[model samples]
Target: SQESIQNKISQCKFSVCPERLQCPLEAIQCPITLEQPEKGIFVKNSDGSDVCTLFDAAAFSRLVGEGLPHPLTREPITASIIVKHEECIYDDTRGNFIIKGN
Candidate 1:
């Protein structure tokens, strides 16, 4: 499994999804943006001891908040700001498992 990821990384060493925009309009603590997703989520992990990832608030509300550790960091998610606007259902059938600035 890691090998597939390794090879994929060799091809796409630095790519991002943002594939799924969360409810609450936007998730602030783990921020995201259509204008500049690259810069948005980078605002996180400002300290240390964890690799902060961009996750949705519903994920923050139901998934992560339900005692699930950060998938990438394996640490509990930090504080997040949830502000609901238009809750749209997003599905990713395509394999955009790639990530961001390495």
Candidate 2:
């Protein structure tokens, strides 16, 4: 939704869970720190055709906890899109979701 986009844009201005951090202990992709047309804000694997959003912890957790089928990946959500230190994997037994570590 447009409202969600606007919210994310605005949230980026402040901060969110971070992917890259100033210090070592931080995890998760921080809200994009760049200016408009933010460097970090992007759709996953955009091929000029499909528009799938990267999974956030909250978003992924909900799908698994709720038992809803995620249309985005045609898979059940399991892991969150995490920071650079993590490995992203897709496991059918683990709910066909991509989990990135950091």
Candidate 3:
């Protein structure tokens, strides 16, 4: 059950930007709390751009094992950005896309 829950949570994570890419504060942290998350997932938008959907670890921690739903109430964090770098790779361990460049 726990493993399944984690897997569901993993799907909501996203990457914001590449390593060499410079971004503003909102791009790196949560728009609501400005909290910088340790993990996220990168997804493409309808406009053919990329956006980062971050996981609310603290919220999940509190919602876990409390008679909640299977995946629980996960409001994934979001960041506005595009990922067009050539050397980017999805890192499963970190749950984000890493850009390998100078």
Maximum-lDDT candidate: 3
- For each candidate, how many residue pairs have backbone atoms clashing (under 3 Å)? 3, 9, 6
Whichever of 1 and 2 has more lDDT, that candidate is 2
TM per candidate: 0.28, 0.28, 0.30
Give lDDT tens digits, candidate 2, residues 1-102. Answer: 333433443333222233332322122232222222212322232222223243443443333355664435444322222122223333334432243432
Best by TM-score: 3
Please say which candidate is ahead in lDDT: 2 or 3: 3
Candidate 1 per-residue lDDT, tens place, 1-102, comes to 333322322332222234444323233223322222322222123224222334332233344335555444454344421111221122234212122323
TM-score ranking from best to worst? 3, 1, 2
lDDT of each: 0.31, 0.32, 0.38
Residue runs of model 3 more than 4 Å from their true location after superposition: 1-3, 10-22, 31-33, 41-52, 58-102
Ranking by lDDT: 3, 2, 1
Candidate 1, residue 89: how far the Cα is off, in Å: 25
**Model 2 clash tally?**
9
